[PDB]
Amino acid sequence: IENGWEGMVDGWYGFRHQNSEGRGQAADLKSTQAAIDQINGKLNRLIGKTNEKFHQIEKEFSEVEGRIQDLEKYVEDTKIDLWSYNAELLVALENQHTIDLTDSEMNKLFEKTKKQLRENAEDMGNGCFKIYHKCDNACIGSIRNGTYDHDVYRDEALNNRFQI
Amino acid sequence: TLCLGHHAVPNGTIVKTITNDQIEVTNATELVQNSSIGEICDSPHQILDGENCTLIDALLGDPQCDGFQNKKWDLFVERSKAYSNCYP
Amino acid sequence: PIGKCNSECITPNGSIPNDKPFQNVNRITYGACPRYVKQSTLKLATGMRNVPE
């Protein structure tokens, strides 16, 4: 897949079939749901998981003092810089995994259509399956819900591929 | 014919990851709160206002801080205009 | 000033919501508060690597 579609809003993964009856666009709903649960699960660990602290040391000062005031300005600065790096590492690690699982789910759906059409369709190298066989819109939707049967289209498609 | 595609946005935001720095993502959510309501509210915690009185003045019995007698609080707030009018 | 809410976090700039796990409003906190950080924006990717057209 070279590029995505600008106007697909009901899902992240789907198909745009085209046959003699016209061209239609339908969204896959199973792989899109699985990506939402993995994304919403990451937000569940972060949102609403705070810790409470009531009494702390003074973190701002007015009158300059000696050693004790320099120590309190260093303990507070150590905690802030360490937590700032921890926030950077947590977001960057989660963003790395979120993009990777999203791209892997796109390739997993590409394999499922190829696995279902084991002997009736092959890869065209453009993320498409050029099929001239008698496969109407209902036949396309049979692939979508996993109810497509290749036995009734095995002998009907093997001879047509040698012809074309 | 049975092509595959994915959702795209004309104007997405930019997040930071381990490998790249300026990668483009369709939808991103803010994680750092950088805004405030503007006032200190006292519904879960018993908040005691300063009213130009510090804690030490109210402890010793400053006559201008006579309202803070036998009072308890969950968080004392000291104003920046607190002044003492008593013996030094 | 003193107002009314239903919120746990208290900062000298005023009360802030505690739903987000990080904040940079002020380093002085009281109660259930998000941890202080130096960054202003930390975008979390909730979508796909976007390509135009």
Epitope: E6, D10, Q33 | - | -
Partner: antibody, heavy 125, light 99 residues
Framework: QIQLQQSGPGLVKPSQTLSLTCSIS??????????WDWIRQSPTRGLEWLGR?????????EYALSVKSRLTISPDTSKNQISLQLSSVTPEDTAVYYC?????????????????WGQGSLVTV | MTQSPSSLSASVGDRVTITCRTS??????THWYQQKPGKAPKLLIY???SRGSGVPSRFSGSGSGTDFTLTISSLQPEDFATYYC?????FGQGTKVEI
């Protein structure tokens, strides 16, 4: 405050065209994180989906399987309306039509939930 | 789109569970709708987990596989309406509750 008042006559000749205008006040059609569906309801089959028209840099259209070759939805930006055009009407379509706004989205994806509905009846000879 | 109840007469304050069994197992797309007779419907709970605007706290939903249940904590005389279940583009046949 989102208010949708749809207009249009509710008495048309069978085997003809149909006009239905859904005026929108308080919100604009040019909304990135929103869509505008069209739902009809009958005592016989019930609620069913017809189509939608959102806006990603220009007006896109979608339609149902049954009324794919008879329904055209024409949006307009001039005075904040959305127009429904039904062609070759049938007296089985004696039902009420609802103009409703989608776009209760999570993570930028329109989940197909509908908000801020309207009211409108239709009957043919 | 199948719903186990079609018409019921529950007392005021009763707890009723309406099961909307679907075909495809996905939870973040399905919603719930309530339509009083003579006006437009509204949205109570979306994505089967979070209530919408203008919804009291007595409405709750659950998600378990391909079966989704909408539960009312206490029935009210003002809650006499037909209930509709939508997954992505198909609506249920309806659920008429009565006081």
């Amino acid at each position: 405050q989102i208010q949708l008042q749809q207009s249009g006559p509710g008495l048309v000749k069978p085997s003809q065209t149909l006009s239905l205008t859904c005026s929108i006040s308080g919100d604009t059609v040019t909304n990135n994180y929103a869509a505008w569906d069209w739902i009809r309801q009958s005592p016989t089959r019930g609620l069913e989906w017809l189509g939608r028209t959102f806006y990603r840099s220009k007006w896109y259209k979608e339609y149902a399987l049954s009324v794919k070759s008879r329904l055209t939805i024409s949006p307009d930006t001039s005075k904040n309306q959305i127009s429904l055009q039904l062609s070759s009407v049938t007296p089985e379509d004696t039902a009420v039509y609802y103009c409703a706004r989608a776009g209760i989205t999570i993570f930028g994806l329109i989940t197909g939930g509908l908000d801020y509905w309207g009211q409108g009846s239709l009957v043919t000879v | 789109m199948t719903q186990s109840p079609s018409s019921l007469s529950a007392s005021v304050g009763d707890r009723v569970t309406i099961t909307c069994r679907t075909s495809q197992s996905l939870s973040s797309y399905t919603h719930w709708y309530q339509q009083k007779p003579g006006k437009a419907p509204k949205l109570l709970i979306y994505a089967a987990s979070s209530r919408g605007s203008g919804v009291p706290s007595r409405f709750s939903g659950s998600g378990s596989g391909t079966d989704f249940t909408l539960t009312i904590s206490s029935l009210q005389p003002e809650d006499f309406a037909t209930y509709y279940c939508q997954q992505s583009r198909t609506f249920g046949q309806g659920t008429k509750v009565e006081i």
